Paper text:
We found that FNIII2 alone but not FNIII1 or FNIII3 could promote cKIT tyrosine phosphorylation, suggesting the essential role of FNIII2 domain in mediating sDscam cis interactions. The gel-filtration analysis supported our observations in the crystal structures: Ig1 mediated the formation of trans homodimer and all the three FNIII domains were involved in the cis interactions.
Recently, a shortened Dscam (sDscam) gene family with tandemly arrayed 5′ cassettes in Chelicerata species has been identified, which encodes ∼50–100 isoforms. Crystal structures and cell aggregation assays demonstrated that both α and β subfamilies of sDscam used Ig1 for the isoform-specific trans recognition in a hand-in-hand manner. Furthermore, the cis interactions were established by the three FNIII domains of sDscam, which assemble into a cross fold with a kink between FNIII2 and FNIII3.
Residue numbers in the entry: 495 to 515, 527 to 587
């Protein structure tokens, strides 16, 4: 089970877009507990909406197969202002 290569874009005051090449996606406000996100299969991108502005978050993604999941690829970001 491999390590996804993830890429962030479209960083707004309330959302970010993740791109990469079953999954487990989680996010958290900085230093808080992780929240598991629903993402459908056969998706290669994901828009996380509903975030606060000017705030630090982390996203992490791991890939799944029948044997289990791999390690998490993590990205920290700060949403835009206003």
């Amino acid at each position: 089970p491999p390590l996804p290569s993830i890429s962030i874009s479209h960083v707004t005051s309330s959302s970010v877009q993740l791109n990469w090449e079953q999954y487990l996606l989680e996010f958290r406000g900085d230093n808080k507990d992780w929240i598991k996100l629903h993402i459908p299969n056969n998706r290669k991108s994901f828009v996380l909406n509903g975030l606060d502005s000017s705030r630090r978050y982390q996203l992490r993604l791991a890939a799944y197969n029948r044997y289990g999941r791999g390690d998490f690829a993590v990205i920290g970001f700060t949403t835009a202002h206003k």
